[PDB]
Design a binder for this molecule. Structure first.
Ligand code: IPM
Ligand code: IPM
Ligand code: CL
Ligand code: CL
Ligand code: MG
Ligand code: MG
Lengths: 364, 364
């Protein structure tokens, strides 16, 4: 039958970049004969304005009826001063991930050929390139651990959060990292704080247990503070980084900025049945919203990750990825990927979606 | 009477760099007429080899009798496979900080004039310079929170750690950050994860309460994942970063590597009475130990931080800092601060201590 997609564009540049993702999806649908139906639902700030909360019931129900969630971006200055639970990002993303048991977050990041110069690394380091996939555990640890809250009053008032992990939780995400490494350059770097946290001692121990199934894959451990330093000095030496929830949050953001190319980066957050939520790694960028400036590549590659991981349409997924490579090596760059002099050559959001869709059609 | 210093050189390059710190201290003692007595105690790997644990009773007692701890570095491959509690770093540093209530960690980091090129940042970013002081809360949060440990067996075996903070704990470290900002460029950036952690919601709230005493100081908040990105793009825009224990651990390491000059960086860990532990930010570097290669500046500036903060000898502290500036701008650089061609000009550990001590003597 038809695949069914819940489309949650959100705030800021979400809707403009989502339009280009749908345009390129239309081209892949025609080329590969896929029957996909999409339904739109509010989420984040637009949900608070239209429904009074950032994750309305009808949106949640819409996502339960779908094969995957194609997600834009949430948040903006309008809602930033609401109580923390009522804000767009916390209010949408944490309950979506908990409800759908999206324990696996994949954040691929690489320096693209020809854009090594946009990286904030020293030129000799960025010239060496990098390609680092972060596999982050997304529904356990300190994010969802209990007890969480506060007690007391005044000076003695105290807050608490609890980080918890079981062997089962560590081994499921570790298996994903090792299998991904096997398909890459055969190295997992597991990131913990095993000199301080009991959860990191168990993490390190269980990763070593899972390693026995993968004697072809190199395993190393690195402390999270050290990892922030080593990714500056030798990012070319990492392949897959295997991280708990909070450490994956932190390290995947540093690796993303090290690319200098945030508008190219996508994320996949999956459960064990292969349902997932696919979104750009970057923000809502409300300052450039509605201008046709925004880079729609991250949203377009989020659609390719959705085709691969939720829809089992690998040919359609890679055809999108190649059309994006074609745009980047064929003079089709948005403003933020151009050196400040070459800027007159910037393409708009729709010029980029048109070129990438036409490339899919032309059989790239 | 005499000040009394407990000298804990540790492992690796600790003893060679400590010798240069004592040499420069002898020169400051003569120039400023300070009467200081030093006693040496084992700590870390050398304590495990000599005493069977990394923090012997006699060493702990020695530190209780002192005005401050002048600390080298602990750890090395020899002890890296011991059980986590028995290892040099965890086994020495966590109990020292807990026992002496060293709640305040200060990690000053800047790009030195003329060495902006050693930074791993893109040349146009490092040319802009930076000077970022990290104030890290060191005895609370998840490091010392209870309950901590594990329960269960097999797949359901689970570990847990608890992050806790009280208003009292947040406000003492926040006051330090604001006072330090007042003496600098009047900006505090408080780093939290207030969209996820109850402790970060209380952190953010209490920092805003303390802010009312400092209307001259700008306050901003930044999420820890965002902070790892912003320090790559605009490190010149930060002055004081105010961090909880785990987030300070992580961010101070990224800022240290961004200098490209780890061998110049020192740390101070203080309690409310002004007693503290002063150490280099870098590792034991056991590969270069005993060679006269190691940069002793970080150990020497740790002695200057000790003079200022524990001994209330500001003139002696700044005379050391200026002698270090003189060495750096007068052609006295260790091997790791030289571009690979200029390397023949490297100075040894003792050449550097001799030059810095002679500069103190000459009245720099
Ligand atoms: C918005 C926040 C709760 C979230 C996280 O901490 O996972 C975000 O930082 C992310 O990385 O997707
Ligand atoms: C050794 C470890 C317990 C320690 C910490 O986590 O504080 C270290 O990383 C540091 O930064 O001083
Ligand atoms: Cl976690
Ligand atoms: Cl903490
Ligand atoms: Mg994040
Ligand atoms: Mg550290």
């Amino acid at each position: 039958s038809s695949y069914q997609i819940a489309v949650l564009a959100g705030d800021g540049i979400g809707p403009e970049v989502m339009a280009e993702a749908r345009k390129v999806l239309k081209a892949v649908e025609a080329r590969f004969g896929l029957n996909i139906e999409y339904t739109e639902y509010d989420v984040g700030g637009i949900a608070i304005d239209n429904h009074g909360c950032p994750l309305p019931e009808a949106t949640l129900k819409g996502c339960e009826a779908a094969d995957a969630i194609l997600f834009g971006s949430v948040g903006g200055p309008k809602w930033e001063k609401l109580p923390p639970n009522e804000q767009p990002e916390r209010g949408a993303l944490l309950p979506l991930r908990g409800h759908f048991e999206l324990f696996c977050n994949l954040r691929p990041a690489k320096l693209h050929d020809g854009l090594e110069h946009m990286s904030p690394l020293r030129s000799d380091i960025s010239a060496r390139g990098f390609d680092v996939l972060c596999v982050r555990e997304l529904t356990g640890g300190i994010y969802f651990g209990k007890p969480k809250g506060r007690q007391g009053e005044g000076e003695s008032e105290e807050a608490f959060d609890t980080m918890r992990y079981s062997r089962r939780e560590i081994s499921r995400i570790a298996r994903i990292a090792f299998e991904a490494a096997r398909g890459r350059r055969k190295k997992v770097t597991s990131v913990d704080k095993a000199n301080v946290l009991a959860c990191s001692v168990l993490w390190r121990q269980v990763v070593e247990e899972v390693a026995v199934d993968f004697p072809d894959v190199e395993l190393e451990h690195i402390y999270i503070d050290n990892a922030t330093m080593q990714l500056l000095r030798r990012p070319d030496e990492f392949d897959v980084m295997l991280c708990s929830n909070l450490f994956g949050d932190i390290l995947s953001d540093e690796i993303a900025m090290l690319t200098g190319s945030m508008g190219l980066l996508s994320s996949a957050s999956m459960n064990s049945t292969g349902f997932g939520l696919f979104e750009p790694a970057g923000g809502s960028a409300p300052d450039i919203a509605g201008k046709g400036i925004a880079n729609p590549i991250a949203q377009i590659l989020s659609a390719a990750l959705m085709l691969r991981h939720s829809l089992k349409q690998e040919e359609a997924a890679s055809a999108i990825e190649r059309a994006v490579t074609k745009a980047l090596n064929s003079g089709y760059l948005t403003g933020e990927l151009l050196s400040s002099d070459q800027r007159h050559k910037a393409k708009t959001t729709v010029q980029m979606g048109d070129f990438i869709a036409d490339a899919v059609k032309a059989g790239v």
